[PDB]
Subunit: 440 residues, 3 copies
C-alpha cells in the first residue's frame, strides 16, 4: 500500500472532479504518515495512479507532501489547434476530437488578480523546512480544453489565453521530476518557482501559451529531451536567476515568442537543441545572463505556413537577431543558423536581418558558427501538417545578405571567430577581436 | 479501467497467440469508446500490460486507435547472435538460451511481394483525419527468434534476414513514443512512415538487420539515448524527407551498413552520438540532404574482430569516407574521427582512405574536426565480447596517411577549416575556402 | 504472473528485512523457470515491485538471473546532509526527516577486508555463460541512512564513509539498465564491473561518497541525464578500461574529488555535460586514456560556500588543472571554463591556476575553448541552498590571470587552437602547433 488508483477511491467521482478525489487521497496519506522518525522513517509518501480516462478537474489539487508521485498511462496528445480550425460540419467524420490518455481536463476558472496559481490544476506549495522534495509527475495528460476570446478578434481557440496552468510549484523545491507528460491547451503548462536539482525530461508540451517557466531563482537543474511548442505571447523554455541549468536535446518548434529565454541566468548551458521559430528573438540572454554556453544548436527561423496564423507575430522585427545576448563572458560555439525568409516580408522595410546580436556586456566568445541565409517566396496553405512539412523540405531560393554578428557599441571586448565574413560581422574592430571566416 | 493485462483477458491464450489477444482487447476498447464528444471526451484510449513472459505472436496486431499504450516490464535482450554461434553441444550448459522480459515472439511468415508490413508484429495504420496520435510502446521485448538462409552460404542465423518487423507504422502519425524497448533478431526493428513529433527514446535495438527507419517524410522528431546495432545490409538509423530531426546521445555500434543514413533530410541535427562501424560509409547525407548540423560526434571505424563475421562487408571501399555528404549548406563541426585499420586490408589496394567526402552540393561548412588515423594488424578471435573489448582498448599501431577531407569537383564553394593539414585536404583551393590545421 | 509485489509475498516482512523477501522471490522464479528451451523460451525472468514505503534491508539481495526488473514508485531523495547539519533541537519542527519513496534502507555492516561487495544492498553476480543480461533497476530509493566517524574529527554524518553500496555488479554483464533511481547516504551508490552496452540513465545520485564507478573493463555503454553529487574522497563518474563510452547530458554538482575520472579509457565521449566542482581536477584522463572526445561541456570551479564543509579539500592544488590529460590523440573542443576563485585561497601561494593540463601523451587536439577567470572574495554561510544559489548568481569580481593550457614537456606534438592568448598557453612552440586566440 501507499498505492492509490483514483478509480478505486471511495470518495468523490474522478470523472466529475478528480481534484476532490486526489485531495482526499492526500488527506489519507497525511493521516497515516503522521510520525517523522519511527524506525528511521515514517513519511515515505505515495503513488497515485490515473488509468486512461477522461477526468474533469473542478477543484485544484494542493500538494503539500514530499515523495508524492502522480502517474498515468498516456501523454494523450492530439492537436486541438488543428481540430478547432477544421470546419465544424466536418467534425462528425473525424475519428476523434479530443486529447486522451490519462487525461485531466482542467475546468477551473481563470486566476484572479492575485495570480495564475489559482488557475493551476496541481499546485505544489509548502513553506517552512525542509524544502518539499522528490515529487514526481509522470506519463499523464493535462488539457486546458479551450482557449478564449482575448479582445484581438482572433479565433478564440487560437488566442492561447485561458488563465489555466497544468502544474504550478510555488515553493522552494528539491529533486522534483516531470517526465513523460503531455500538456495541451493551457495558457501555462508548467511553472516552477525556486527549483533545485529539478529534471524536466521527455515531455510533450505543445499548443500551450507558455510551456516551461522556471521562476524566482534556481540551481543545478535540467530540461532535456522535450518536445515543446508554445504561443506567440509566451515562452517555450524560460528561466530567471538560475545557475548551473542544462538545457539539451530538446526539439522546440513554433510558435512561442522565443525558444529559450533567460533573465539573469548564469553559468548554464543551452546546447544540442533543435530550435524552430516563425519569429525573431529565438534565444534571448537578458538582464546580465553571463558565463553561459550556447553550443551546437540547430536554429531555423522562417515564416508561418498555416493560413489561420498568417499575420500573427511576436512583435519583434528582423534587427532583433535569432540569438540576442545582454551579459558578460558567454560562449557561443558551433551553432548552425538557417535564416529562411522572404525578402519583402523583412521588417523594417529594407533592413538586413541580424543573426547574432550582442547588445550589452563584455568578454563574449563567439566561434565557428555557420549562418545560411536564403530569400524564398512566402505562402500560406490550409492543410496544417502538409504545409509545415513541405515548408521544411523546400529549398528553392535566392541568396540573402545578412548580418551574422552585430556587436552594438554597448557591448565590447568580445571575440568573434569564424562566424561570418568581414561584411557579415558588424563590430568595432578596435575594441573586439574579430577573425573573418575565410572566403573565396 | 481502460487497463488490460494480457494474462487476464478471457479470449485466446497469450502464450500461443498474443496477437489474437491484443486484437480482441482493441475490439473491446472500440466497442466501449464509440462516442467522440460526450462530456468533452469519450475516446481516451487504453493501456495493455504484458507481464514478463514468453508470448508467441501468430496474428498481426492492428492498431487503429489513438492513445493506445502497450507496455511491459523488461526489454529482455540477450545476444542470440553469440548463442547461435556457440557450438550446439555446449548449449545445455548455458544458464539460458533465449531473450526474455515481456517477450513477444514474432511467428509470422515473411511478408509477401506487397510488403514487409505484413511481416510486422504490430502494424499501426489508419487513414482519414485526424492523424493517429500518441500511441506508446514501452519496456517490452520483440524477438524475431531466428534468421534464415539467404543464398549466400553464410550461417542462417547470421544473415539478418527473416522478413519480420517489430513495429511498423504505415500512416501519418503525431506524438508517437517508442521507449525502453528491446528488439532482437528482426529483419526490421522499427519502421515508421510519415512521422510528426515522434520520440524514439532510450531503446535497445540490436542484432536486427535494420534498426530504425523513418520513411515517406516527417518532421520535428527525435531519436535519442538509444543503443543500436544493425546488420551489414541494413540501417542503424535511417531517415528520408525529414525536416527538423534531432539525432543525439545514441550509442550506435556494429554492424549496420551505416550508422546514420539520410536521404533528402533537411534542417536537422546529428550531434553528440558515439558511432562505431566495421565498414566505410558510417554517416551518409544523400539526395539533397541540406542545412544539417553534424557536430561533436565520436566516430570510430575499424575491422570486425569476431571470426564468424570475417569477410562480411557492406560492399563499400575506403574511398567512400566515414562521413559522406551530397547536399548544400550543411555544418560539420567538432567531430572526432578515429580510423583504425590495417593498411593491407585497405581497398582498393594502395588507396589513401578518406574520412570526410563532399561528393556534391555547395556551401558546406566543415570546421574543427580531429582526425586520428592508425595502421594496426588485423586479427579475428572466437570469443565475441573479449575480442570486441580487447580491440577497443588496443593502441599498438604505426602511423597512417589519410585524406581528412576530399571535396569532389562536383562540390564547390565549401569552407574547410582546421580539419586537416594541406596534404590531408584534397580540394580545389580556387573555389573552396580552405584553412589548414596549423602544423609542426 | 512473473509479477511480484514485496508487500504481497507470504515469506518474511519487507519492513524488517526486504532482503530476505526479495531473495525468497528470486528462489521462486528459479524454481518455476527451470527449463531453458521449452516452446522457444522458459526463462523470461520477472518484475519485483516495491510500493512507496520504508523497507529495512538486513540481508544482501543476490541477483543471479537474467531479465530481472526491480522497480518502485519514487526516487525519494531529500538532503540528509542538510538535515544532519541542522541543530538537533530544531528537528521536531521539520516537516520530515528522512528520504522516502520506494525506500530500501541499507542496514548491512561494512564490508570486510575482502571487499565492498559484501556491503552492497543488491549484488549481481553470476559466472559461466552467457553473461547475465538485461537486469533493470528502476525508480526506487536506496538509502545508506548515516555516515560514520572516520578518524578525521569531522562530523560523522559528513564523512561519506559507511562501507555500504547501493548496487554492486561483480560479473560481466550485457544490456543492463539503471534508470530513475535515487541513491542517498551510501559510500558507493553504483559499482558495475565488466559492463557491455549498459545504460545509466536519468538517475539522482547524490550525497554518496562515490556515485558511479565502472570497473574492470567495458564497452559500448552510456551514462546520460543524471543528476550526480559525490564526496571529496570519491568519484562522481568513474570508468576504467572502457571503450566506446558516452557520457552526456549529466548535471554533475559538488562535492566529488572529480566530476569525471577515466583510467585507461579509449575511444569515448564526454560531451555536453554541466560540471560543477569546489576543487581542482574536475575531469581526469589518466593512464593512457586516448582518442576521447571532450566537447561542449560547461565547467565551473569555485569555492565551497557552506560553512560545515569549509576547509574540506580533495588534496589537489591549483596547478592540477580543471581538465587534466595523460594520453594520446584526444580531442578537446568547444568547452566553456569558468574559474571563480579567491586569489588568496590559491595554492600553492602565488601560483597561476591552470585550466587544461596535458601531462603526457602526443597528438591531442585542443580547439575553441573559452576560459573565463575571476578573482572573488571567499565566504561561508550556514544556510545551505541559499548560499549555493547566491554563490552561482554572484558576479562581482576582479580579473584573474590564468594558464588556459599548460603542456608539460612530457606531452608533445599537440595542437592548441583558439583556447587562450600566447601568455595563457604555456607550451613549447617548437614541438606543438599553437594558434593564440586573437586579442585586442
Amino acid at each position: 500500500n501507499n498505492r492509490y488508483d483514483v478509480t478505486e477511491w471511495p470518495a468523490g467521482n474522478p470523472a466529475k472532479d478528480i481534484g476532490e478525489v486526489i485531495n482526499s487521497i492526500i488527506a489519507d496519506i497525511k493521516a497515516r504518515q503522521g510520525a517523522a522518525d519511527v524506525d528511521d522513517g515514517g513519511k515515505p509518501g505515495a503513488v497515485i495512479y490515473l488509468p486512461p480516462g477522461d477526468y474533469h478537474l473542478r477543484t485544484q489539487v494542493l500538494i503539500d507532501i514530499s515523495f508524492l508521485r502522480i502517474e498515468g498511462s498516456g501523454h494523450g496528445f492530439t492537436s486541438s489547434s488543428i481540430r478547432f480550425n477544421v470546419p465544424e460540419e466536418e467534425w462528425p467524420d473525424l475519428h476523434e476530437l479530443w486529447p486522451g490518455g490519462s487525461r485531466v481536463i482542467v475546468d477551473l476558472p481563470a486566476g484572479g488578480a492575485g495570480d495564475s496559481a489559482a488557475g493551476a490544476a496541481f499546485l505544489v506549495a509548502r513553506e517552512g523546512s525542509p524544502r518539499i522534495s522528490s515529487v514526481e509527475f509522470s506519463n499523464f495528460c493535462i488539457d486546458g480544453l479551450h482557449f478564449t476570446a482575448d479582445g484581438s478578434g482572433r479565433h478564440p481557440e487560437n488566442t492561447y489565453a485561458n488563465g489555466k496552468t497544468g502544474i504550478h510549484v510555488a515553493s522552494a523545491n528539491d529533486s522534483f521530476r516531470v517526465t513523460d507528460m503531455g500538456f495541451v491547451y493551457l495558457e501555462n503548462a508548467l511553472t516552477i518557482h525556486k527549483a533545485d536539482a529539478l529534471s524536466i525530461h521527455h515531455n510533450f508540451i505543445a499548443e500551450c501559451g507558455s510551456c516551461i517557466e522556471l521562476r524566482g531563482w534556481g540551481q543545478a537543474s535540467k530540461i532535456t529531451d522535450n518536445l515543446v511548442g508554445a504561443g506567440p505571447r509566451g515562452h517555450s523554455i524560460y528561466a530567471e536567476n538560475h545557475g548551473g541549468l542544462l538545457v539539451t536535446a530538446n526539439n522546440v518548434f513554433p510558435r512561442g515568442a522565443s525558444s529559450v529565454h533567460f533573465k539573469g541566468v548564469t553559468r548554464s548551458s543551452v546546447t544540442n537543441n533543435r530550435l524552430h521559430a516563425f519569429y525573431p528573438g529565438m534565444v534571448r540572454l537578458e538582464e546580465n545572463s553571463s558565463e553561459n554556453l550556447v553550443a551546437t544548436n540547430h536554429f531555423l527561423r522562417d515564416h508561418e505556413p498555416w493560413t489561420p496564423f498568417f499575420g500573427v507575430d511576436n512583435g519583434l522585427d528582423d534587427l532583433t537577431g535569432l540569438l540576442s545576448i545582454s551579459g558578460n563572458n558567454n560562449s557561443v560555439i558551433g551553432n548552425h543558423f538557417s535564416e529562411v525568409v522572404d525578402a519583402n516580408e523583412i521588417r523594417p522595410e529594407g533592413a538586413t536581418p541580424v543573426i547574432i546580436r550582442l547588445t550589452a556586456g563584455t568578454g563574449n566568445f563567439v566561434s565557428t558558427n555557420h549562418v545560411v541565409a536564403m530569400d524564398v517566396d512566402a505562402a500560406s496553405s490550409d492543410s496544417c501538417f502538409e504545409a509545415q512539412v513541405d515548408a521544411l523540405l523546400a529549398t528553392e531560393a535566392a541568396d540573402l545578405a545578412v548580418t551574422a554578428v552585430l556587436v552594438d557599441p554597448g557591448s565590447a571586448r568580445n571575440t568573434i571567430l569564424d562566424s561570418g565574413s568581414d561584411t557579415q560581422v558588424v563590430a568595432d574592430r578596435a575594441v573586439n577581436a574579430i577573425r573573418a571566416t575565410p572566403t573565396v
